[PDB]
Design a protein around this nucleic acid. Structure first.
Length: 1188
RNA sequence: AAGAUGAGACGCGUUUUAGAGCUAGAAAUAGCAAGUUAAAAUAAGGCUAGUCCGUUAUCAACUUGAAAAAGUGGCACCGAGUCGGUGCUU
DNA sequence: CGTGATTCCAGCGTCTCATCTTATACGCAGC
DNA sequence: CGCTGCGTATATTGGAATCACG
């Protein structure tokens, strides 16, 4: 048997594989070909590449799922509101809700009157006259006190609930506090009263302009400070301003506090932080802060709301109505001005829905920005146009009610408006008064981000824990959903498990047990050297306890000097002691211990072991939750041990982060023979003081065996890796390709497996060698480990894996240098063979390296310089112009095996690179994704429209188009051809769309009979996924891009000379070498027309693009006078014409050639279909012309 | 510092319908109006009936296994336009 | 009256939170 | 030995429509 090696090159969209025997020669083997064709054996080289579409992140799918949930919940909220309105609306208007529901149907299909709101034309007209927009209805309901019809109330409430704005501001906003300057003046006055010693000159400073400017918070703060030379941005007044702006000021400095007084108004915890300020400095500032809070409100209302507050308590409705009136006035003025001045453009602006005029801005498709762009030169051309220009410069001209920039509106405004409306109308409708709280809750309720979807055990994203078997409505959310359990699971389901105990769960970062473990583990390897000691000795358990009590339990940090003085000098009376294993200070510290000692003020409580679990239940509680209410609820169980002040301090205290070792791995498991745990051993390990690594790697202790036993699917193992989904797909395809290759070579595993991943998108000499050899990226290490585990499964009796297969890792830079140094150039656009070529080179390089320098295996699985690939060079430069020669045959001195034959290896490499047949295979994959193009098309008399619902005929209501076909199906059956319904046998591809895929797979016979096919041969059905391969004739092979489109599937085996000439001429990436290359470029410029001739021949044989090829030839003849480099680059562009895959347009100089599309699939019905294996070696050819 | 994964939310957009378009012109076609908004859906859909799930990952062919997956393909040499030819076994 | 050429077009803009993970250095400890 | 950890620092391509057009 011939032992071989496998080279692999992974990439986002390609996986190159190569099999090399000795002398670095790709074998050529005959493979049997199945099918009903006539061939029985085909020759194939053992090198190739696999092509596939890059993997997609779940980001888009997650966004779509979230949108689905949001729409579902919105509809549920509407349903709740209607249910509240059910009986009363039925008393008032029996079918009002029904008219609301069928509003989308056309008049033919409506079961009620076409007017939803009133069910009659006259009332609808009158209503539309009275309230031009819904905001008029809202303003009327808020302001008027007269009893209103329940339908209008429902419409206003539904408009509020359905569109409620964001929840980025919590608490009460007090929208009446809209005084941008008066509140500022009041705050300044209060500050001056509290700081009469340091008054502030607020005169001459416009608070409104600075604070309501459409700029960043920092910029406006700096602008305000600039007008106050005596005050700074970091000053107390400056920090109050920053807090009003929504920043995070640090009051610790201004108030000289030890606690970091970080306060932000938006945060729910703000009030509690204010309470902290109510416990350190005093209450005199409270009103001050309140004023600042009020100031903040005005700022938040400044940009969103531009209206007087005294006129009404619904500022949003007033602002919308004012904007509508401004729009109306500007529209009337603009119409008058256009008719007076430019009557010709009047039709273009007020009638052309296709243009970007007002007709297109309203009725057609045109944004506000687009409309402004269209209209601005028109307004400048006209005269008497100043107000409109000012508004356009302000982006406040002809604005609509429902614009894109309404997302800044806090839900508090809607809540206040709804509350006001309910209060106004509660005197007329008892149920509104009774269910006011319910509607307020519906408006203000959210599913908390830490609860997750309210599933019932049917979801792969859900962790919500219930309490009772009922329906989670917003009014009984707390009664049903267990907030504590759900919030704990929301953290636990995504936390890393212990590496040594995969079933167990890691401990928090600041656990007292974890800190103790770190302290003891660091203390175990501590040695002390004194005069009376011959040899340094480890610290005894009693000594360790004494040190911890003296230092670790008394100071937030422990230093080397503190250890030397406070223990050896004080207790041991050691005046000279040296400590090894630690420098500077000690990284481990009892930060949690000192913090809890500060808070609860009971050292004995901490020192009691019986409290340990409780202590853990505190720290975990201080890590699981971020809401202070949840933390308080959890700590209420332990509120009996500590005073309310301690409870408040604990609620304030909240640290995050998680450790890396579980509790069972520290204090859970106990050694069988000794009866001691890991913590027990760390507290007393005799005199050896074995640390955690020694304890877990000790063959004499049960811990290692327990770890091994507890430590006991390729796809799942890959899905848990860290990397982009495309790279993970590439890794999986690489592994399956390795499996296929092993099956190919007679099930004899290769000696070496070199792996290189392209890209995401004396001691010094030894270090440089290590840098050039090791692969810094860890995903490469993961892939190498996976391949080593899969290929190697022979662990000897000494508990060591027999390395029958050596996984090597290599970096792209070395191979690229090899290519560019030995003129083994590549062009990305010519063809895909480079992928396989790269793999081959990788294998060769790797193999040669492991042959030449076996001792370096540990670096990636001798000389005086740091170079490692230099021995391939036939001639070596000594960096001083002293060109010398290496031995012609390079061999390892110790072994004596020949590792490089310059007289044969270079020629063999050239031949392998020049081999015309390369196993390029496009990974056939059933396509999935959106059912079609999402854009909803208007009703047309076309059959390509796709229904958006069951009863919505696309001829009337419009719908989707351009469906995506997953895989085609070749059907041989009969149809009712002609008027006589003659059953003519037919053979054509039928497109299986993603929408219809399930129906077809459930019952193909009925699905095919539904589309008009009769007498279907069930066994003759052949499934052709996307990129299925067909051979028509004369070697013309095409990939089935869809049910009705083909792709070029043949590659151009360009001679290496042409490739090198193209690389050198175009400057794709030693002056004498450059001059020689230029001379060769000119010499092959004499040959340049040969490249064009080869392109034309390949196009005639396989492409059949007559018009495009003729235009290419004409343009080339026209541009023959162009410089050689320009022509070379343009021909590199020309390579797009014949490159594999979907045809693409290109540009030869100034002539643009569009893509030729093979839109007919009639020919492949009589061609030979090919099933290429994963590596493409095992091929199954079926002659489709023998069917039918 | 960067990137990935998941959860909770907003604002649009896009379609059909509701916004009586008026005058004259046999009709077609011109002139004159208005235009800002609202409802429903926003993947068809499924049952596992939940404020659940539906665009990520997986997938050559034949047999088996629900399916994850398992089984299924001789070697050497010469050359190379997509792989051919020659010798042994079969 | 089908058929090759030519052209048009595709849902999108934010916010909050959590879990991470890498990415590379440094120091300590090791079986 | 190489790993094991502990800590610190931060556009594209298929569909679809239309247009000569023999």
């Amino acid at each position: 048997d011939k032992k071989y090696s496998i080279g692999l090159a992974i990439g986002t969209n390609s996986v190159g594989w190569a099999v090399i025997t000795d002398e670095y020669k790709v074998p050529s083997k005959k493979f049997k070909v199945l099918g009903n064709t006539d061939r029985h054996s085909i020759k194939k080289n053992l090198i190739g590449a696999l092509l596939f579409d890059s993997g997609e992140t779940a980001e888009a799918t997650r966004l779509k799922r979230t949108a689905r949930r949001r729409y579902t919940r919105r509809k549920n909220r509407i349903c709740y509101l209607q249910e509240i309105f059910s009986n009363e609306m039925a008393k008032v208007d029996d079918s009002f809700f029904h008219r609301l529901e069928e509003s989308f149907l056309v008049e033919e299909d409506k079961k009620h009157e076409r007017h939803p709101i009133f069910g009659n034309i006259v009332d609808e007209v009158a209503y539309h006259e009275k309230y031009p927009t819904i905001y008029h209805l809202r303003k009327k309901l808020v302001d008027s006190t007269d009893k209103a019809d329940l339908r209008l109330i429902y419409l206003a409430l539904a408009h509020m609930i359905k569109f409620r704005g964001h929840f980025l501001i919590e608490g009460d906003l007090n929208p009446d506090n809209s005084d941008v300057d008066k509140l500022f003046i009041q705050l300044v006055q209060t500050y001056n009263q509290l700081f009469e010693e340091n008054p502030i000159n607020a005169s001459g400073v416009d608070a409104k302009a600075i604070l309501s400017a459409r700029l960043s918070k920092s910029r406006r703060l700096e602008n305000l400070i600039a007008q106050l030379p005596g005050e700074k941005k970091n000053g107390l007044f400056g920090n109050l301003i920053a807090l009003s702006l929504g920043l995070t000021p640090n009051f610790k400095s201004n108030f000289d506090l030890a606690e970091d007084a970080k306060l932000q108004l938006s945060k729910d915890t703000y009030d509690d932080d204010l309470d902290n300020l109510l416990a350190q400095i005093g209450d005199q500032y409270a009103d001050l802060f309140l004023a600042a809070k009020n100031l903040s409100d005005a700022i938040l209302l400044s940009d969103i709301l531009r209206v007087n507050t005294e006129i009404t308590k619904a500022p949003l409705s007033a602002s919308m109505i004012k904007r509508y009136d401004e729009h109306h006035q500007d529209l009337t003025l603009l119409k008058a001005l256009v008719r007076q001045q430019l009557p010709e453009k009047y039709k273009e602006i007020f009638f052309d829905q296709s243009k970007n005029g007002y007709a297109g801005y309203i009725d057609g498709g045109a944004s506000q920005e687009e409309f402004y762009k269209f209209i601005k030169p028109i307004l400048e051309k006209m005269d008497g146009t100043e107000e409109l220009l000012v508004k356009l410069n302000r982006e406040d001209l002809l604005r609509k009610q429902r614009t894109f920039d309404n997302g800044s509106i806090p839900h508090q405004i809607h809540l206040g408006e709804l509350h006001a409306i309910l209060r106004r109308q509660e005197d007329f409708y008892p149920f509104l008064k009774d269910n006011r709280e319910k509607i307020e809750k519906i408006l203000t309720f959210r599913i908390p981000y830490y609860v997750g979807p309210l599933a019932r055990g049917n979801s792969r994203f859900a962790w919500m824990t219930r309490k009772s078997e009922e329906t989670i409505t917003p009014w009984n959310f707390e009664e049903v959903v267990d907030k504590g359990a759900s919030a704990q699971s929301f953290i636990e389901r995504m936390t890393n498990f212990d590496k040594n105990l995969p079933n167990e769960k890691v401990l928090p970062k600041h656990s007292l047990l974890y800190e103790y473990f770190t302290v003891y583990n660091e203390l175990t390897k501590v040695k002390y050297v004194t005069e009376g000691m011959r040899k340094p000795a480890f610290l005894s358990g009693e000594q360790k306890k004494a040190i911890v009590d003296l230092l670790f339990k008394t100071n937030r940090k422990v230093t080397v000097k503190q250890l030397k003085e406070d223990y050896f000098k004080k207790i041991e009376c050691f005046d000279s002691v040296e400590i090894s294993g630690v420098e500077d200070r000690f990284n481990a510290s009892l930060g949690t211990y000192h913090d809890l000692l500060k808070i609860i003020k009971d050292k004995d409580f901490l020192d009691n072991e019986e409290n340990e679990d409780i202590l853990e239940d505190i720290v975990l509680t201080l890590t699981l939750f971020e809401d202070r209410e949840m933390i308080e609820e959890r700590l209420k169980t332990y509120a009996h041990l500590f005073d309310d002040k301690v409870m408040k301090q604990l609620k304030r205290r909240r640290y995050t982060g998680w450790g890396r070792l579980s509790r069972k791995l520290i204090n859970g498991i106990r050694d069988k023979q000794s009866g001691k745990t890991i913590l027990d051993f760390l507290k007393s390990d005799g005199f050896a003081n074995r640390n955690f690594m020694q304890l877990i790697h000790d063959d004499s202790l049960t811990f290692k065996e327990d770890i091994q036993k507890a430590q006991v699917s390729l796809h799942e193992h890959i899905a848990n890796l860290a990397g982009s989904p495309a790279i993970k797909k590439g890794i999986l395809q690489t592994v399956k390709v390795v499996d296929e290759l092993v099956k190919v070579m007679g099930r004899h595993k290769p000696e070496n497996i070199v792996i290189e991943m392209a890209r995401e998108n004396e001691l010094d000499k030894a270090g440089f060698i290590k840098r050039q050899l090791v692969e810094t990226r860890q995903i490469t290490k993961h892939v190498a480990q996976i391949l080593d585990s899969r290929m190697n499964t022979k662990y000897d009796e000494n508990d060591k894996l027999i390395r029958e297969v050596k996984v090597i890792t290599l970096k792209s830079k070395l191979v690229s240098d090899f290519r560019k140094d030995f003129q083994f150039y590549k062009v990305r656009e010519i063809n895909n063979y480079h992928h396989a070529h790269d793999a081959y080179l990788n294998a060769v390089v790797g193999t040669a390296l492991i042959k030449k320098y076996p001792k370096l295996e540990s670096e990636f699985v001798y000389f005086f310089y740091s170079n490692i690939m230099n021995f391939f060079k036939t001639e070596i430069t000594l960096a001083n112009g002293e060109i010398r020669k290496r031995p012609l045959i390079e061999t390892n001195g110790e072994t004596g095996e020949i590792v490089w034959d310059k007289g044969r290896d270079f020629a063999t490499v050239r031949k392998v690179l020049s081999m015309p047949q390369v196993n390029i295979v496009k990974k056939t994959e059933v396509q999935t994704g959106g059912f079609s193009k999402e854009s909803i098309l208007p009703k047309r008399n076309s059959d390509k429209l796709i229904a958006r619902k069951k009863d919505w005929d696309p001829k009337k209501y419009g719908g989707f188009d351009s469906p995506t076909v997953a895989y085609s199906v070749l059907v041989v059956a009969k149809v009712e051809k002609g008027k006589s319904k003659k059953l003519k046998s037919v053979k054509e591809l039928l497109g299986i769309t993603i929408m219809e895929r399930s129906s077809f797979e459930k019952n193909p016979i009925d699905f095919l009979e539904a589309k008009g096919y009769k007498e279907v041969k069930k066994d003759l059905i052949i499934k052709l996924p996307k990129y299925s391969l067909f051979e028509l004739e004369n070697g013309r092979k095409r990939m089935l891009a869809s049910a009705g489109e083909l792709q070029k599937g043949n590659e151009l085996a360009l001679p290496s000379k042409y490739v090198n000439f193209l690389y050198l001429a175009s400057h794709y990436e030693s002056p004498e070498d450059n001059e020689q290359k230029q001379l060769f470029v000119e010499q092959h410029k004499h040959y340049l027309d040969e490249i064009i001739e080869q392109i034309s021949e390949f196009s005639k044989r396989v492409i059949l693009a007559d018009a495009n090829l003729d235009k290419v030839l004409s343009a080339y003849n026209k541009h023959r006078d162009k410089p050689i480099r320009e022509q070379a680059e343009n021909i590199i562009h020309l390579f797009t014409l014949t490159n594999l895959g979907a045809p693409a347009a290109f540009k030869y100089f100034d002539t643009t050639i569009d893509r030729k599309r093979y839109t007919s699939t009639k020919e492949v019905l009589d061609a030979t279909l090919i099933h290429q294996s994963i590596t493409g070696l095992y091929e199954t050819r079926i002659d489709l012309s023998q069917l039918g």
